[PDB]
Design an enzyme around this catalytic site. Structure first.
Site, mmCIF file in Angstrom:
data_model
loop_
_atom_site.group_PDB
_atom_site.id
_atom_site.type_symbol
_atom_site.label_atom_id
_atom_site.label_comp_id
_atom_site.label_asym_id
_atom_site.label_seq_id
_atom_site.Cartn_x
_atom_site.Cartn_y
_atom_site.Cartn_z
ATOM 1 N N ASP B 10 0.859 -1.173 0.000
ATOM 2 C CA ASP B 10 0.000 0.000 0.000
ATOM 3 C C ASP B 10 0.896 1.223 0.000
ATOM 4 O O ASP B 10 1.997 1.181 0.540
ATOM 5 C CB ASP B 10 -0.889 -0.038 1.263
ATOM 6 C CG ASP B 10 -2.015 1.004 1.249
ATOM 7 O OD1 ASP B 10 -2.260 1.645 0.189
ATOM 8 O OD2 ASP B 10 -2.665 1.149 2.318
ATOM 9 N N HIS B 27 2.556 3.824 -9.524
ATOM 10 C CA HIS B 27 2.419 2.410 -9.817
ATOM 11 C C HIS B 27 3.659 1.863 -10.506
ATOM 12 O O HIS B 27 4.052 0.722 -10.289
ATOM 13 C CB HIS B 27 1.178 2.156 -10.670
ATOM 14 C CG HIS B 27 -0.098 2.336 -9.915
ATOM 15 N ND1 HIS B 27 -0.250 1.912 -8.612
ATOM 16 C CD2 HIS B 27 -1.262 2.946 -10.251
ATOM 17 C CE1 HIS B 27 -1.447 2.259 -8.172
ATOM 18 N NE2 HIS B 27 -2.081 2.890 -9.147
ATOM 19 N N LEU B 110 11.680 -20.096 -5.440
ATOM 20 C CA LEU B 110 10.664 -19.289 -4.758
ATOM 21 C C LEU B 110 9.263 -19.515 -5.344
ATOM 22 O O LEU B 110 9.131 -19.557 -6.567
ATOM 23 C CB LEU B 110 11.034 -17.827 -4.963
ATOM 24 C CG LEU B 110 9.996 -16.804 -4.503
ATOM 25 C CD1 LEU B 110 9.962 -16.758 -3.006
ATOM 26 C CD2 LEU B 110 10.366 -15.426 -5.061
#
Lengths: 214, 211
Positions: B10, B27, B110
């Site tokens: 956030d 963004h 991962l």
């Protein structure tokens, strides 16, 4: 409606043991100081227009013992008492005494105080899930009919205001399988203060954090 | 010994405003931060990283992103998984996700889980529906349903349990991100805005877990 803006506070009470150890005292002394802190929290919440307070002792005898005398005090303070958690295996005498305590205070209009006893957030969800499973089995429910709203109506405390604020004292930053479903949108407030030391000003600080964050 | 970190990212909008730029610039900066976090997790032995961007153009951008980055993740032995209700995304995007997951499904480095239209309550409900299907079929009794069983039907049950949840941006809430999965996770809240969240910030969160 209250100024701080929250209707239902849940607290993970942790720190009783460490508090006693700091004093050079055995854990039972901290649990007693913890019980005193609970009474202070209950009065603060009621005096501050909070609708519900849900308490989770992070870790039976004291519970068993304190029940009678404590319940009488809560009743005289117009507190409605409800036990949440899995009491299905508690012996029948205890289950009856619990029911009697809830029945006695059921009509009280002050604070609704929920005490977790053998409670787990995952267990809570599972018990609700089993209730929906039964409906499906009876042919009264299509799996595609199960949505969040329905499951919500089967988790503990769905009839009370949603939990607005969760406070955990004692310094750890985890939910420890207390409420899960119910805290999806709750403000989470962590304080290093040990539960026996958590007082009105500490509670006011959590409410103020909520107000400023909401 | 933190094996699975989940992050509520956030702060992209607020960040861009502070820099005097439009939301899009925030963004773009946020995406660079994602690249950096994914590399950090892979470089530091984290087994799984689950990312939740806290909130037809967006969807197409997802298609594009998948088309341009999946091959590299695949070469890096990263398993990509999208968690969330993608059932109503357009068919083409659903297929791109399926192909990207299928391609990397056997990778052992991962595991990167990206939330797309995900909600913690929805996740639990979808698992409940699966158990309900089994009950309406007669292969399961309502009283056989227990935590262990529901756990096997919620997202990411095959991975290490979430050990650490980090939320950047200043808010102190889970906002219906993971619920069932974070019963025992360390919760780390930082005021740092997502675009600024770097390796030092990530290490700080890991230290909170370590303590």
């Amino acid at each position: 409606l209250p100024a701080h803006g929250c209707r239902h506070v849940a607290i993970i009470m942790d720190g009783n043991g460490r508090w006693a150890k700091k004093q050079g005292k055995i854990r039972a002394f901290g649990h007693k100081a913890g019980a005193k802190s609970v009474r202070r929290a209950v009065s603060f919440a009621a005096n501050n227009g909070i609708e519900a307070l849900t308490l989770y002792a992070f870790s039976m005898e004291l519970f068993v013992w304190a029940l009678d005398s404590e319940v009488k005090s809560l009743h005289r303070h117009n507190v409605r008492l409800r036990i949440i958690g899995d009491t299905s295996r508690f012996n029948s005498r205890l289950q009856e005494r619990i029911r009697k305590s809830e029945a006695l205070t059921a009509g009280n209009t002050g604070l609704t105080l929920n005490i977790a006893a053998n409670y787990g957030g995952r267990w809570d969800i599972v018990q609700g899930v089993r209730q929906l499973a039964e409906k499906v089995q009876q042919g009264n429910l299509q799996p595609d009919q199960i949505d969040e709203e329905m499951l919500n109506q089967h988790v503990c405390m769905h009839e009370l205001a949603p939990v607005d604020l969760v406070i955990r004292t004692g310094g750890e930053h985890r939910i420890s399988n207390f409420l899960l479903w119910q805290i999806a949108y709750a403000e989470l407030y962590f304080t290093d203060v040990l539960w026996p030391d958590f007082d009105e000003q500490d509670f006011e600080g959590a409410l103020n954090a909520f107000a400023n964050r909401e």
